[model samples]
Target: GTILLDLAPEDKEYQSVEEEMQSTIREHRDGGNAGGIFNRYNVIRIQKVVNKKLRERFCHRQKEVSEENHNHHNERMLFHGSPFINAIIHKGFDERHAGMFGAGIYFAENSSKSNQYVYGIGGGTGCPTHKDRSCYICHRQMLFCRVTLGKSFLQFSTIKMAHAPPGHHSVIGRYAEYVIYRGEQAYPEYLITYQIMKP
Candidate 1:
């Protein structure tokens, strides 16, 4: 057996375009769009398909009451439409898990943007300023940490306000994960990937 890999001219061009797209999304997330908000509640439902294809279908919806003075929230749910037999597969479904797990940010209340950055020690140089200064305190920030068993971690490098419904566009975190199991004490693993979507 042998493995061969090479980057032809077209392949190189494709890579450049991909990099540019990624960079543009990152800039938007870190700059003016950090305060995009989403609804507080979201719902996700899945249906298994047993046919000639032996597939599974997933449906996710955002259910939230409109804010006062607002007619409605134009929130929507998105995911990969590729073919799959099961959403519970380990390695093959990890990316799908990322999509399902990350849908909450689209339905979350946006954090208020900050204008000042605070440091732990003395007011020091090299301490960068942040858009939302309220998240500076060590103890205060730590108190709100959220952890779940069905999921492991979720993170973003930069986030921005984009699209409708007052939400954010972010450079999806590389290590975001979703956990699946065979039973109470059977096979267990994590589905990990990055999924970027509009709010």
Candidate 2:
């Protein structure tokens, strides 16, 4: 009994989310001297998450930990891009994937960086960046997760890390990326589906 409820264009949330997502996006890296901006198509509030109790479970503990640390939960909204839209919605952040840093869930504050990784509904195509030929639907989906950053161990470059270093809860990629070894450490709270106005 899950829902992907849409915010009506007239509703405040519809407009609010449009601006929020737009703020997180960066201009196309390549000098198209241009790149069109995002026209947020829909902002869907998801429900009935995978693992059923993952959110409540982790959040409860996170709350407890926060108070334990004098209220420093360090929770943040970060972006994770992937074509496994339905998979993540139904199966959660599958630990089967890893890249750049390690076997943990990777996130970034930059939608531009995350957007490039998201492919189309099919596993064989790209979303909007680098223009991967064709996918019937041009729209792309990206996840906005509530990440429990706890205490991050900042690292300047890549490391073959399987877990966070001592005294740290996560590893940061030059302050641009986050890697969490535990899946429950974060929750996918929003599914942002938008269209790129190509440069």
Candidate 3:
């Protein structure tokens, strides 16, 4: 038998998920609502299993509350700071699965069916075949992520950079461009480009 912690330097290891959750809970308590300070759309991508299930229940609770109130559209707002919400914000953590797995939660005007990814070095949005880009939704830049639709996958330049690309430039000089190939690199699935925009 060997001591697992002794195998590596203590400083090299990351914080346990339990630690992360404690810090996150404290952050939310101090910050009011986590989405308010970070994501402006009220949508939050939670990774804790308990919180995900809790949020799922809240979604259902919202439906029931809405029905009880004659299906009034505004009833959903009343659930924001309810006692259950307080419980989730304050005590949504567990010892098991505390350092390994979690899910997500997104708040939306109607239903949160879709999810998005943001900045990173790899993935389909990487260089050569793809480039990093930002988008605007719910009038926020934090939600900006790679758009893999038609335009994002198309080539816009034969050379490294192009004089002009699709879409007209705005007063802020925002635009889009394409990159067909990079040195010692090529993309066959689709041509990629770099796009810039301002909120």
Candidate 4:
């Protein structure tokens, strides 16, 4: 797969994705009680990711565990938002951050929930688009990744660990967020350019 392939604005993929984002706000969902962070206003563009190596390995893993999962190969779609969207489009997710769920790349089904993690060099005042690492953009970037949760271990709190316990593919962390310790276990399939609405 090529790097960042822009999806036409009119494409269903684009609209559906944006819709997923907008619907989350004001819905009174999980993640936090007395908090903030939905400052981003709207989505500007959607790009389909196609990294050759990433896609290849993701597919191979899919087939390896297909027959055992709940008919869908145990794969699920979740959103990963980043301020440095360009680097991810070129490089990929890095599990080197200090997340509450230990050493792993994290994902969220809640789009607005993911937005809290994305911000630019300018902090709150940066351009709606962030100062991206590559083609120069940020405002905000949220990539939808397909996570292969072969056999997940569900937990309601944070745990500091390098990987899942004994026999598990990943973790369904607090508030339904996902954490995958392996680099190839999740593939970034799509990304959207959006901005925090005016505060």
Q: Tell me each candidate's TM-score.
A: 0.16, 0.76, 0.17, 0.77
RMSD of each: 18.1, 4.5, 23.3, 5.1
Error of 4 at 145 (Å): 1.5
Model 3, global lDDT = 0.21
lDDT of 1 by residue, 1-199 (tens): 1111222325553344234323322222434233122221111111211222111111111112222214342322112211121232322223222233333221111111111111221112312343332222221110000111221224443323221122321213432322222111111111111112334
Pairs in steric clash, model 2: none
For model 1, the local distance difference test gives 0.22
**Which candidate has the top score in TM-score?**
4
Q: How would you encode candidate 2's per-residue C-alpha lDDT over 44-157 as one tens digit per residue?
A: 342323445666657775775476445787888888877676777655565656556777888888775666667622223453555542232466677778888888878887
RMSD in angstroms, candidate 4?
A: 5.1
List ranges where model 2 is wrong by over 4 Å. 28-52, 60-70, 120-124, 127-137
Q: What local lDDT score does residue 46 receive in model 1, on the 0 to 100 scale?
A: 19
Error of 1 at 30 (Å): 7.1
Cα shift from native, residue 4, model 3 (Å): 28
Give the alpha carbon lDDT tens digit for every residue of 78-196 in model 4.
Answer: 88766666776666666664367788878888776666556532133433443322212345577777888887888888788798776677888875778888767788788887655
